[PDB]
Design a protein around this ligand. Structure first.
Ligand code: CLA
Ligand code: CLA
Ligand code: CLA
Ligand code: CLA
Ligand code: CLA
Ligand code: CLA
Ligand code: CLA
Ligand SMILES: CCCCCCCCCCCCCCCCCC(=O)OC[C@H](CO[C@@H]1O[C@H](CO)[C@H](O)[C@H](O)[C@H]1O)OC(=O)CCCCCCCCCCCCCCCCC
Ligand SMILES: CC1=C(C#C/C(C)=C/C=C/C(C)=C/C=C/C=C(C)/C=C/C=C(C)/C=C/[C@@]23O[C@]2(C)C[C@@H](O)CC3(C)C)C(C)(C)C[C@H](O)C1
Ligand SMILES: CC1=C(C#C/C(C)=C/C=C/C(C)=C/C=C/C=C(C)/C=C/C=C(C)/C=C/C2=C(C)C[C@@H](O)CC2(C)C)C(C)(C)C[C@H](O)C1
Ligand SMILES: CC1=C(/C=C/C(C)=C/C=C/C(C)=C/C=C/C=C(C)/C=C/C=C(C)/C=C/C2=C(C)CCCC2(C)C)C(C)(C)CCC1
Lengths: 170, 146, 132, 165, 164, 185, 131, 33
């Protein structure tokens, strides 16, 4: 019913911004929340990866591969299959903690949780909100980038590629 | 529909509630201005007002003054602004003396001697500093071109 | 009991709130339109009416107009900032133009205007010939 | 010296008792002093790193500043940088004001004004110990930046490592 | 309930118009957001329309009439400093608007605070408000149509009434 | 001669100014003294620079075109760079002073005694116990007493320098160098 | 009512060239030289009116007014002496079955109100008080 | 040098002096002894 209390509400007044009324009951909300988080986490990593590659960085043995969606089209599928295998394994490993917010995998075999990062309940809520918000942004970001790549070849719109300043990494 | 009514519902006061005098826009702007805003201390009120007035004053002098075309024109403009600020500060000091007197008690009421003195001080610091900021900014103007 | 008026920019100012203020009151038998000294037109109420002004002259000017409407029950007061009120006109209940037994003479000189003293005579005295 | 000093953070192993030989506490208010001590100290802590970082670890990819000498770069850098720098500092100063008014503290108070790493201890004992460490590091930094400058202008004034120069 | 109280916006040609029922379960706050958005989007559209029309007509007496008559080309020609001022200025007004919104008694869309003098009881008031909304609704569609014509069809002038 | 009487008479003749601390008062003695002490440094620095030829391009006049008629001494003649630089140095200092006068802190020694300033009482007290003919030893170090003593000393030196310069018919800078042992030049 | 409130002012008549305090005083007891407007949540002119959210127009908020009931009192107090003189004369002219000045006043003012009483000649009064 | 006096005194006589004098007069006429 009232999901205003849930983290990620647009604002105090609008509460839950569900224009198409996708969410109807808590059961649905949990489903949608889990999905949003998953897509968000995945997207956050994706943007990081796209930028790294597009800017020019390549792993050992990957110095001739192309960047962007072009890579997926050109690079050999055999060298892409590893990704699926390393991801499917994770899919199986992550274990949802019962009676907890959607996306909490504290029950996973390897140690996972707020650990030393959070102490008070408020701290936990803040970190959670930030994870969700940054994911929401990336989700839009990765799309924005890919679209513009196809449109003009400039994935960053205002510049060709990033230049990093890593003193210690040098 | 009448958009003009007696002010404060007093038909005999010398004022009227027009859209200009009493609109959400005017009310909002005036309420949050440093002079009438709530919570600001006398010093901070002066500071904000000074910061605002000093930044725009360097312009007239710098671009239209006697040494505008000289390489030291901006520097001269800065000095001129500081001079004007000093004159205005003298005025503030003198006004306070006459309007408020010599010893005060209420405190924290912009309309007392102590508060006024603090207000004046803030104005001077803010104004002079703001003018300096403009000097730094006008030293190199960005073209915002990619 | 305020008469019906829509407001003006010619009303009272701060002096009315920090120095002194005035007020006139009267009773009417009909609702009619009068012109107010401040500027504009207003409609009096059928009965008691009260109006505030900044000067005594403004109040007395309105009284003149009221007399045209055949109203002669007007009263003028001065309200100080603290709330103190002074009844000013008609002071003794009788209009000044009508001799009322019980009123004493003030500022009267018992001689023709030409019998005042010479200025030189009262030199270095501080008084004036007309007060001498 | 002022009595309040006896009840404040600052005295430690190297300074068991209040250190105020000239009794400056008599003139400058105790509160203002601590606020200033931390402010100048925190700023100095940052400076020390900035004095050598560009030289030791490289510079950004631009040509506005060609020198690496800490003092020289001041004039080489574009004025626009300096203006924006003053602005950011002003923003920080405002944050401290607003947050303090909300009851938060930037001076070892119960509610941190800036704890993005969320590492402020809850127990008062640890809090006290944590504050002492900051003050020390701050005092040390102020001395250090001064020393660096000294050797820079009057060579030999201070024993500074060559790379720091 | 917003639906049971709203009076402005419901006119003669179609009456209440919500074929897709996008406001059936929305609360008063959401509905208020919608009305404010509707008015703002519409008002901005009306202004844009006038701007485009003037430029297209050739009455752009600024910068020595250097910029092109094509509105979309002109935007590219405008220095960024001009654009920055625009965004920042509008942003300022947006802030002030937020202050007004917070004040108690805010009627969605009213920045002049006309509520102080007039209410929706007056039919003249509601009618004039309806005119703003109706013209705004039309303007929104128009600005979208014109852009299509300029970007795809290739013209930035009237192709409807031009033929006397 | 009793000093006190003369001061009293001044206050009576010019009461308005006396109220703020103007005139023959301890406040003035302190402030004027502080300035004199500071100046000695400036004057010595000027002497050193002059002798060691530090001032850039001295003995040259500023351009009447770059600068204006404000830089003219007589007709089209303009001020030399040296004097201009010396003045700018002093202006740096004066600016600091103006800020301190117009925008005093809550724990600072204000130029004038203001009943509405928090430091009024302390200042009034300090001044009340800082008057004497002979420097009060036993209060050496950083004390109000030391400050006043040193200030009087500095002010006296200024007077002496001017007089000696005149008697010996030399510039004040020269006398300074002489009293230092000719080190600067 | 302090009938001397106005007279008790700071005005001091000069020697020559001044009419004086007159009958109701020459100047208000209060000084008009008050301050200007103040920030929200503050007051300036002593017992001033809080401007609420519009401190800029605070001076337009009235705080000085006339109570109709109080108005009656001021009328009576300032005209007390006149009433006294009037009734005294009525008493002097051998009133029919007279009682007490005050009593007569009440009776005579019970009818003919008070204002009418002040504006009536002793003759009319005697005619009225024949009963 | 005395020649510098015109450029040191005129600024004072025509600007500083008049200002302070006017200020003092204002303070004198606005005070209620
Ligand atoms: C996209 C898939 C892909 C492909 C086709 C290659 C291909 C290659 N990698 Mg490689 N690599 C990849 C991803 C990939 N890499 C990633 C994701 C990482 C990060 C962990 C590395 C880290 C890595 C290292 C550290 C080394 C290689 C090396 C090599 C070469 C020999 C493989 C090896 O280790 O010995 C069979 C070969 C050209 C080796 C090489 O070229 O030797 C110098 C080597 O030392 N890779
Ligand atoms: C799938 C990746 C992965 C793997 C291999 C591990 C593996 C490990 N984690 Mg872990 N961890 C993970 C994800 C993972 N974690 C995530 C996503 C979180 C955030 C919720 C944490 C939070 C976490 C904490 C708080 C701690 C570990 C600890 C540990 C170590 C015991 C072990 C090496 C523990 C450890 O040994 O820390 C040094 C420990 O205390 N991890
Ligand atoms: C009144 C008309 C007028 C105007 C416009 C000017 C203009 C100028 N004179 Mg001139 N002058 C005038 C009359 C005028 N003069 C007269 C009558 C005399 C004889 C006494 C002189 C004698 C004179 C001399 C001797 C000199 C000048 C100089 C100057 C220049 C310097 C400007 C300056 O420093 O102003 C500074 C201005 C300000 C600090 C404020 C300007 C007013 C602001 C902008 C108003 C803002 C209002 C605002 C929009 C309200 C809305 C705000 C809201 C939106 C928030 C400038 C070109 C100098 C020069 O170099 O000549 C070219 C110079 O040496 N003037
Ligand atoms: C900014 C866009 C916008 C918004 C937010 C609204 C919002 C509203 N309109 Mg409305 N309207 C618009 C544009 C908009 N209108 C336009 C352009 C027209 C002209 C056709 C109308 C004509 C119209 C009528 C005739 C009536 C309303 C009414 C209403 C209100 C109740 C209906 C409702 O809930 O709609 C919900 C709408 C939204 C939540 C947003 C609209 C959905 C977006 C725009 C999806 C985009 C669809 C569209 C096809 C995009 C393509 C456009 C173009 C490329 C072809 C509501 C406040 C009714 C009213 O006032 O009752 C009180 C009413 O009777 N509208
Ligand atoms: C605060 C006062 C102020 C001042 C001094 C200016 C000054 C200027 N504006 Mg500007 N502007 C202002 C307020 C102001 N604006 C406001 C409130 C808005 C609305 C938000 C704008 C919107 C605006 C636009 C849209 C443009 C300017 C432009 C300009 C410049 C004229 C062209 C030029 O650079 O010639 C020297 C000039 C620097 C133009 C510009 O810079 O283009 C070159 C331009 O296109 N202004
Ligand atoms: C509300 C209706 C409406 C609107 C919005 C427009 C809008 C426009 N007309 Mg148009 N027009 C209209 C009615 C309208 N017209 C009618 C009724 C006639 C017949 C008299 C014309 C005849 C007409 C001509 C002959 C021309 C325009 C042109 C224009 C464009 C230039 C703007 C300008 O200054 O015009 C003027 C602009 C898009 C001009 C254009 O297309 O420029 C490229 C142009 O040359 N209009
Ligand atoms: C004897 C009195 C006197 C003197 C010495 C000056 C001197 C000057 N006037 Mg001037 N003026 C005077 C009377 C005087 N004025 C009168 C009576 C009027 C009214 C008609 C004017 C109206 C006037 C105008 C309208 C302008 C001048 C300007 C100037 C300056 C032009 C030269 C220059 O280099 O400008 C370049 C400026 C500088 C190099 C800056 C110099 C540093 C400033 C002056 C410091 C001021 C600080 C000062 C101590 C503050 C006063 C404090 C207060 C207590 C007195 C010059 C400083 C022009 C100017 O630029 O004003 C500054 C100008 O626009 N004057
Ligand atoms: C500033 C610190 C370093 C300055 C420096 O190193 O000088 C070095 C530089 C020298 O810059 C000079 O500029 C001239 C004009 O262009 C010359 O042409 C030369 O460029 C140059 O020699 O000083 C400056 O110009 C920058 C200082 C700007 C100060 C910012 C304003 C601060 C507020 C001033 C008002 C004070 C009054 C009360 C304050 C409250
Ligand atoms: C006649 C008489 C008496 C008397 C007397 C006497 C002897 C009166 C004499 C009083 C006397 C002789 C008082 C000296 C002042 C010197 C001052 C103030 C110097 C200031 C110096 C300052 C402020 C320094 C300024 C500078 O630093 C600045 C500003 C810039 C630098 O570039 C350079 C310098 C350093 C210069 C009696 C007997 C006592 C009582 C009797 O009843 C009346
Ligand atoms: C250095 C320098 C220069 C510079 C420079 C620099 C840095 C300039 C900096 C400019 C800058 C920061 C400008 C900043 C603009 C910000 C704006 C409008 C914000 C509006 C916020 C709004 C509406 C908020 C709305 C709200 C929303 C909806 C949610 C609600 O719940 C609550 C709420 C939050 C209230 C120049 C430009 C001066 C040139 C010079 O030569 C050199
Ligand atoms: C028309 C209009 C408008 C308005 C406009 C205007 C009027 C503007 C102005 C503006 C301004 C007028 C601004 C200002 C600014 C300022 C500044 C920005 C400053 C700064 C400063 C600083 C930052 C600092 C300084 C300092 C100090 C404080 C001291 C020490 C030193 C220093 C330097 C640090 C708008 C758009 C709204 C809208 C429409 C209408």
């Amino acid at each position: 019913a009232d999901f205003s209390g849930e983290i990620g509400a647009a604002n105090a007044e609008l509460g839950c911004w569900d224009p198409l009324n996708f969410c109807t009951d808590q059961a649905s909300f949990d489903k949608m929340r889990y999905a949003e988080l998953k897509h968000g986490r995945v997207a956050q990593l994706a943007a990081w990866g796209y930028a790294t590659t597009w800017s020019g960085a390549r792993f050992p043995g990957c110095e001739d591969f192309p960047a962007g969606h072009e890579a997926v089209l050109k690079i050999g599928t055999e060298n892409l299959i590893p990704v699926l295998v390393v991801a499917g394994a994770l899919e199986t490993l992550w274990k949802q903690k019962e009676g907890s917010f959607p996306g909490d995998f504290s029950a996973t075999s390897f140690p996972v949780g707020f650990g030393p990062f959070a102490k008070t309940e408020a701290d936990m809520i803040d970190l959670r909100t930030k994870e969700l918000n940054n994911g929401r942004a990336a989700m839009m970001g990765i799309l924005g980038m890919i679209v513009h790549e196809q449109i003009d070849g400039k994935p960053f719109i205002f510049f060709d590629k990033f230049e990093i300043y890593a003193p210690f990494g040098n | 529909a009448n958009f003009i009514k007696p002010y404060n519902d007093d038909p005999f006061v010398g004022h009227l509630a027009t859209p200009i005098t009493s609109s959400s826009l005017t009310r909002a702007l005036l309420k949050n201005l440093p002079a009438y805003r709530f919570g600001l201390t006398p010093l901070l009120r002066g500071l904000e007002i000074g910061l605002a007035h000093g930044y725009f004053l360097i312009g007239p002098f710098a671009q239209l003054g006697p040494l505008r075309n000289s390489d030291i024109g901006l520097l001269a403009g800065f000095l001129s602004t500081i001079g004007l600020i000093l004159i205005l500060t003298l005025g503030l000091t003198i006004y306070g003396a006459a309007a408020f007197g010599q010893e005060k008690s209420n405190g924290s009421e912009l309309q007392t001697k102590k508060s006024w003195d603090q207000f004046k001080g803030g104005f001077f610091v803010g104004a002079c500093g703001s003018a300096g900021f403009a000097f730094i900014c006008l030293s190199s103007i960005p073209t915002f071109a990619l | 009991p305020f008469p019906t008026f829509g407001g003006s920019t010619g009303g009272w100012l701060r002096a009315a709130e920090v120095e002194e203020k005035y007020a006139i009151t009267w009773t009417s038998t009909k609702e009619q339109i009068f012109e107010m000294p401040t500027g504009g037109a207003a409609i009096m109420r059928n009965g008691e009416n009260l109006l505030y002004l900044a000067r005594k002259e403004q109040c007395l000017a309105l009284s003149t107009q009221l007399r045209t409407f055949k109203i002669n029950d007007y009263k003028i007061y001065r309200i100080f900032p603290s709330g103190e009120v002074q009844y000013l006109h008609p002071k003794d209940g009788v209009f000044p133009e009508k001799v009322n037994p019980g009123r004493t003479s003030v500022n009267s000189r018992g001689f023709s205007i030409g019998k005042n003293p010479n200025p030189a005579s009262i030199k270095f005295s501080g008084i004036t010939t007309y007060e001498s | 010296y002022a009595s309040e000093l006896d009840s404040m953070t600052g005295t430690g192993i190297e300074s068991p008792k209040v250190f105020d030989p000239l009794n400056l506490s008599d003139y400058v208010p105790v509160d203002w002093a601590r606020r200033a001590e931390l402010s100048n100290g925190r700023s100095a802590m940052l400076a020390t790193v900035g004095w050598f970082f560009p030289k030791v670890f490289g510079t950004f990819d631009s040509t506005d500043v060609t020198t690496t000498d800490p003092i020289d770069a001041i004039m080489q850098a574009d004025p626009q940088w300096w203006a924006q720098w003053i602005l950011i500092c002003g923003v920080f100063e405002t944050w401290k004001y607003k947050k303090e008014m909300e009851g938060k503290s930037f001076l070892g108070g119960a509610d941190p004004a800036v704890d993005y790493l969320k590492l402020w201890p809850a127990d008062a004992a640890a809090q006290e110990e944590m504050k002492t460490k900051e003050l020390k590091n701050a005092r040390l930094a102020m001395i250090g930046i001064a020393g660096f400058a000294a050797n820079h202008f009057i060579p030999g004034s201070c024993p500074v490592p060559d790379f720091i120069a | 309930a917003w639906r049971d109280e709203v009076v402005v916006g419901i006119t003669a040609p179609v009456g209440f118009f919500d074929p897709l029922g996008l406001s059936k379960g929305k609360d008063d706050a959401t509905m208020a957001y919608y009305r404010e958005a509707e008015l703002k989007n519409g008002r901005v559209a009306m202004a844009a329309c006038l701007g485009w029309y003037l430029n297209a007509g050739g009455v752009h007496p600024a910068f020595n009439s250097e910029l092109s008559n094509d509105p979309l080309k002109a935007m590219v020609e405008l220095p960024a400093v001009g654009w920055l001022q625009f965004v920042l200025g509008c942003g300022a007004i947006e802030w002030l608007g937020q202050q007004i919104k917070e004040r108690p008694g805010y009627v969605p869309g009213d920045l002049l605070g006309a509520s102080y003098w007039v209410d929706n009881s007056d039919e003249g008031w509601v009618m004039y408000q309806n005119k703003e909304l109706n013209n705004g609704r039309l303007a929104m569609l128009a600005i979208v149509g014109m852009v299509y014509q300029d970007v795809f069809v290739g013209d930035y002038g009237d192709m409807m009434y031009k033929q006397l | 001669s009793v000093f006190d009487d003369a001061v009293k008479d001044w206050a009576e003749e010019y009461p308005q100014f006396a109220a703020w601390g103007w005139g023959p008062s301890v406040q003035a003695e302190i402030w004027n003294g502080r300035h004199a002490m500071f100046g000695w440094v400036v004057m010595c620095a000027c002497a050193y620079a002059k002798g060691h030829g530090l001032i850039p391009d001295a003995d040259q006049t500023l351009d009447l075109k770059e600068w204006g008629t404000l830089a003219t001494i007589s007709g089209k003649n303009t001020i030399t760079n040296e004097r201009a630089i010396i003045l700018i140095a002093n202006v740096h200092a004066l600016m600091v002073g103006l800020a301190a006068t117009i925008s005093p802190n809550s724990f600072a020694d204000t130029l004038l005694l203001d009943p509405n300033h928090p430091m009024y009482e302390w200042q009034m007290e300090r001044n009340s116990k800082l008057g004497g003919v002979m420097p009060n030893l036993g209060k050496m170090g950083v004390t109000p007493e030391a400050e006043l003593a040193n200030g009087r000393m500095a002010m006296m030196g200024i007077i002496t320098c001017i007089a000696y310069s005149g008697i010996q018919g030399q510039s004040m800078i020269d006398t300074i160098n002489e009293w230092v042992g000719g080190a600067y030049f | 009512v302090d009938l001397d409130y106005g007279m008790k002012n700071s005005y001091v008549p000069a020697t020559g060239g001044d009419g004086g305090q007159g009958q109701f005083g020459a100047q208000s007891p209060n000084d008009w030289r008050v301050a200007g407007t103040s920030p929200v949540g503050e007051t300036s002119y002593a017992g001033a009116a809080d401007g609420g959210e519009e401190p800029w127009f605070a001076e337009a908020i009235s705080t000085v007014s006339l109570d109709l009931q109080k108005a009656d009192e001021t009328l009576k107090a300032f005209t007390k002496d006149a009433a006294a003189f009037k009734i005294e004369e009525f008493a002097a002219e051998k009133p029919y079955g007279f009682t007490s000045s005050d009593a007569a006043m009440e009776e005579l003012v019970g009818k003919l109100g008070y204002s009418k009483f002040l504006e009536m000649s002793t003759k009319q009064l005697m005619k009225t008080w024949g009963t | 040098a005395a020649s510098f006096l015109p450029s040191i005194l005129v600024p004072l006589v025509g600007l500083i002096f008049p200002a302070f004098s006017m200020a003092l007069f204002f303070l004198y006429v606005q005070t209620d002894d």
